[PDB]
Design an enzyme around this catalytic site. Structure first.
Site, PDB file in Angstrom:
ATOM      1  N   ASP A  16      24.908  -8.812 -22.178  1.00 31.98           N
ATOM      2  CA  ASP A  16      23.503  -8.594 -21.846  1.00 31.98           C
ATOM      3  C   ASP A  16      23.079  -9.522 -20.709  1.00 31.98           C
ATOM      4  O   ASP A  16      22.031 -10.165 -20.752  1.00 31.98           O
ATOM      5  CB  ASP A  16      22.626  -8.794 -23.079  1.00 31.98           C
ATOM      6  CG  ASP A  16      21.208  -8.292 -22.872  1.00 31.98           C
ATOM      7  OD1 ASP A  16      21.006  -7.420 -21.996  1.00 31.98           O
ATOM      8  OD2 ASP A  16      20.293  -8.774 -23.575  1.00 31.98           O
ATOM      9  N   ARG A  64      16.260 -11.583 -17.093  1.00 30.63           N
ATOM     10  CA  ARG A  64      15.428 -11.967 -18.229  1.00 30.63           C
ATOM     11  C   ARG A  64      16.140 -12.941 -19.159  1.00 30.63           C
ATOM     12  O   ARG A  64      15.476 -13.631 -19.942  1.00 30.63           O
ATOM     13  CB  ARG A  64      15.004 -10.725 -19.012  1.00 30.63           C
ATOM     14  CG  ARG A  64      16.181  -9.941 -19.564  1.00 30.63           C
ATOM     15  CD  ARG A  64      15.751  -8.685 -20.297  1.00 30.63           C
ATOM     16  NE  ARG A  64      16.909  -7.910 -20.723  1.00 30.63           N
ATOM     17  CZ  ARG A  64      17.495  -6.976 -19.987  1.00 30.63           C
ATOM     18  NH1 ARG A  64      17.034  -6.649 -18.790  1.00 30.63           N
ATOM     19  NH2 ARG A  64      18.570  -6.354 -20.463  1.00 30.63           N
ATOM     20  N   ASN A  65      17.469 -13.006 -19.099  1.00 25.58           N
ATOM     21  CA  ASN A  65      18.251 -13.929 -19.909  1.00 25.58           C
ATOM     22  C   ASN A  65      18.700 -15.158 -19.128  1.00 25.58           C
ATOM     23  O   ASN A  65      19.542 -15.918 -19.618  1.00 25.58           O
ATOM     24  CB  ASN A  65      19.461 -13.208 -20.505  1.00 25.58           C
ATOM     25  CG  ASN A  65      19.075 -12.243 -21.610  1.00 25.58           C
ATOM     26  OD1 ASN A  65      18.166 -12.513 -22.394  1.00 25.58           O
ATOM     27  ND2 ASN A  65      19.764 -11.109 -21.677  1.00 25.58           N
ATOM     28  N   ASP A 120      21.583 -16.458 -24.538  1.00 25.60           N
ATOM     29  CA  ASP A 120      21.511 -15.239 -25.334  1.00 25.60           C
ATOM     30  C   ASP A 120      20.270 -15.343 -26.211  1.00 25.60           C
ATOM     31  O   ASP A 120      20.217 -16.181 -27.118  1.00 25.60           O
ATOM     32  CB  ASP A 120      22.772 -15.063 -26.176  1.00 25.60           C
ATOM     33  CG  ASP A 120      22.714 -13.838 -27.066  1.00 25.60           C
ATOM     34  OD1 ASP A 120      21.948 -12.903 -26.750  1.00 25.60           O
ATOM     35  OD2 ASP A 120      23.429 -13.814 -28.090  1.00 25.60           O
TER      36      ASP A 120
HETATM   37  C1  LIG Z   1      19.813 -20.484 -26.726  1.00 28.54           C
HETATM   38  O1  LIG Z   1      18.492 -20.752 -26.265  1.00 28.54           O
HETATM   39  C2  LIG Z   1      17.648 -19.737 -26.246  1.00 28.54           C
HETATM   40  O2  LIG Z   1      17.891 -18.677 -26.781  1.00 28.54           O
HETATM   41  C3  LIG Z   1      16.400 -20.025 -25.499  1.00 28.54           C
HETATM   42  C4  LIG Z   1      15.444 -19.036 -25.278  1.00 28.54           C
HETATM   43  C5  LIG Z   1      14.283 -19.307 -24.578  1.00 28.54           C
HETATM   44  C6  LIG Z   1      14.051 -20.587 -24.080  1.00 28.54           C
HETATM   45  C7  LIG Z   1      15.031 -21.578 -24.312  1.00 28.54           C
HETATM   46  C8  LIG Z   1      16.197 -21.323 -25.007  1.00 28.54           C
HETATM   47  N1  LIG Z   1      14.606 -22.761 -23.733  1.00 28.54           N
HETATM   48  C9  LIG Z   1      13.388 -22.613 -23.126  1.00 28.54           C
HETATM   49  O3  LIG Z   1      12.775 -23.502 -22.537  1.00 28.54           O
HETATM   50  C10 LIG Z   1      12.990 -21.219 -23.323  1.00 28.54           C
HETATM   51  C11 LIG Z   1      11.793 -20.729 -22.828  1.00 28.54           C
HETATM   52  N2  LIG Z   1      10.938 -21.600 -22.267  1.00 28.54           N
HETATM   53  C12 LIG Z   1       9.722 -21.511 -21.546  1.00 28.54           C
HETATM   54  C13 LIG Z   1       9.312 -22.531 -20.697  1.00 28.54           C
HETATM   55  C14 LIG Z   1       8.125 -22.467 -19.992  1.00 28.54           C
HETATM   56  C15 LIG Z   1       7.287 -21.366 -20.121  1.00 28.54           C
HETATM   57  N3  LIG Z   1       6.081 -21.340 -19.381  1.00 28.54           N
HETATM   58  C16 LIG Z   1       6.208 -21.046 -17.965  1.00 28.54           C
HETATM   59  C17 LIG Z   1       4.875 -21.618 -19.965  1.00 28.54           C
HETATM   60  O4  LIG Z   1       3.837 -21.606 -19.347  1.00 28.54           O
HETATM   61  C18 LIG Z   1       4.854 -21.909 -21.456  1.00 28.54           C
HETATM   62  N4  LIG Z   1       4.534 -23.260 -21.826  1.00 28.54           N
HETATM   63  C19 LIG Z   1       4.702 -24.277 -20.800  1.00 28.54           C
HETATM   64  C20 LIG Z   1       4.561 -25.660 -21.417  1.00 28.54           C
HETATM   65  N5  LIG Z   1       3.283 -25.835 -22.083  1.00 28.54           N
HETATM   66  C21 LIG Z   1       3.133 -27.145 -22.684  1.00 28.54           C
HETATM   67  C22 LIG Z   1       3.058 -24.776 -23.047  1.00 28.54           C
HETATM   68  C23 LIG Z   1       3.225 -23.396 -22.439  1.00 28.54           C
HETATM   69  C24 LIG Z   1       7.683 -20.338 -20.960  1.00 28.54           C
HETATM   70  C25 LIG Z   1       8.873 -20.411 -21.672  1.00 28.54           C
HETATM   71  C26 LIG Z   1      11.455 -19.296 -22.962  1.00 28.54           C
HETATM   72  C27 LIG Z   1      10.969 -18.820 -24.177  1.00 28.54           C
HETATM   73  C28 LIG Z   1      10.656 -17.481 -24.327  1.00 28.54           C
HETATM   74  C29 LIG Z   1      10.826 -16.605 -23.263  1.00 28.54           C
HETATM   75  C30 LIG Z   1      11.311 -17.077 -22.050  1.00 28.54           C
HETATM   76  C31 LIG Z   1      11.629 -18.418 -21.895  1.00 28.54           C
END
Ligand SMILES: COC(=O)c1ccc2c(c1)NC(=O)/C2=C(\Nc1ccc(N(C)C(=O)CN2CCN(C)CC2)cc1)c1ccccc1
Length: 312
Positions: free
Chosen positions: A175, A179-180, A193
């Site tokens: 996959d 997006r990943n 993943d």
């Molecule tokens: C095996 O590992 C995994 O499977 C895995 C999966 C996802 C993430 C991960 C490991 N590790 C991360 O960091 C992940 C994400 N991180 C993130 C970081 C910043 C944001 N942004 C841009 C924000 O604005 C959100 N956020 C920022 C910080 N303030 C304090 C709060 C709000 C959004 C998602 C994320 C999760 C959901 C979908 C997309 C990515």
């Protein structure tokens, strides 16, 4: 689908991840996790931003991403989350994957502590910098935080190095897509993943085929039509990712609904044209990745050496 299959002689087979060992060296005290907002949630699992006290340096705390299950998860999901931890423990550490930092397997539900990537997923990042992109910077004040061809080339290079790492561990992604891919400090891209943390039912990028939902537009033909996932079929998905990267987060095959004609066209040689900002040598890599013959596709080790000469 639950149907008959005619087969022909052609190898690799999946391992049962429950049989992989879990090294308890990753065990981290649950009482040292401070939970923040939920970053993203699938149907059964979710990723929560958290603060880990003394995880790496005993003096200070660090922001981490904690992967965990919802209350609605059943025993099969809890087994699946444990198996995901066993795979991460098996693979080891690399710069271009979202690495395992710790785990809480005691005193409550399983918590998988991964690296936090402050920029989020690469797909939403690219679509956000669409109006802020130039091939290269000419007065530099006008392109303060602009995306450049130098960045996209580095992204292609790091994802290729990350996939090359997975292939060397006999790991197939199945996959690979923007997006990943996650982006962190210093424009470091990390493959991961999502597993239980992405709701496949609500994502249009996964097409309902029979009873399963598959990322058809990213998949190699032998995967869609013969259920064959290999190291070479990942290379196909890398080519589709490159098209995403150099079109700045555009959906692949834009404007084409997935139907029988689409599958037919792919089988007859239909391929996407070159993205607007793709360098010629990068589009060459795309076309080789999209070869119907998996033997004529480059390995990720070759892709790394190919892009390396372009960077230099
Ligand atoms: C095996 O590992 C995994 O499977 C895995 C999966 C996802 C993430 C991960 C490991 N590790 C991360 O960091 C992940 C994400 N991180 C993130 C970081 C910043 C944001 N942004 C841009 C924000 O604005 C959100 N956020 C920022 C910080 N303030 C304090 C709060 C709000 C959004 C998602 C994320 C999760 C959901 C979908 C997309 C990515």
């Amino acid at each position: 689908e639950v149907q008959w299959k005619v087969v022909e002689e052609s190898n690799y087979s999946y391992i049962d991840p429950t049989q992989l060992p879990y090294d308890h060296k990753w065990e981290f005290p649950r009482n040292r996790l401070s939970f923040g907002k939920t970053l993203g949630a699938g149907a059964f699992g979710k990723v929560v931003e958290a603060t880990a006290q003394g995880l790496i340096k005993s003096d200070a705390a660090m922001t981490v991403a904690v992967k965990m299950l919802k209350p609605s998860a059943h025993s099969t999901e809890r087994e699946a989350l444990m198996s995901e931890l066993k795979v991460l423990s098996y693979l080891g550490n690399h710069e271009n994957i979202v690495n395992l930092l710790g785990a809480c397997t005691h005193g409550g539900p399983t918590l998988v502590i991964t690296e936090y990537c402050c920029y989020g997923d690469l797909l939403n990042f690219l679509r956000r910098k669409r109006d802020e992109f130039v091939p290269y910077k000419v007065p530099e004040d006008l392109y303060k935080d602009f995306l450049t061809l130098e960045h996209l080339l580095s992204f292609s290079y790091q994802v290729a190095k990350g996939m090359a790492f997975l292939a060397s561990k006999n790991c197939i992604h199945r996959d690979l897509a923007a997006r990943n891919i996650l982006l962190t400090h210093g424009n470091i891209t990390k493959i991961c993943d999502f597993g239980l943390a992405r709701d496949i039912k609500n994502d249009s990028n996964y097409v309902d085929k029979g009873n399963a939902r598959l990322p058809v537009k990213w998949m190699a033909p032998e995967s869609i039509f013969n259920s064959v996932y290999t190291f070479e079929s990942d290379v196909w998905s890398y080519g589709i990712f490159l098209w995403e990267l150099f079109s700045l987060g555009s959906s692949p095959y834009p404007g084409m609904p997935v139907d029988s004609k689409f599958y037919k066209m792919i089988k007859e040689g239909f391929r996407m044209s070159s993205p607007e900002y793709a360098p010629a040598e990068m589009y060459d890599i795309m076309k080789t990745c999209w070869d119907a013959d998996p033997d004529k596709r480059p390995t990720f080790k070759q892709i790394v050496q190919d892009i390396e000469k372009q960077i230099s």
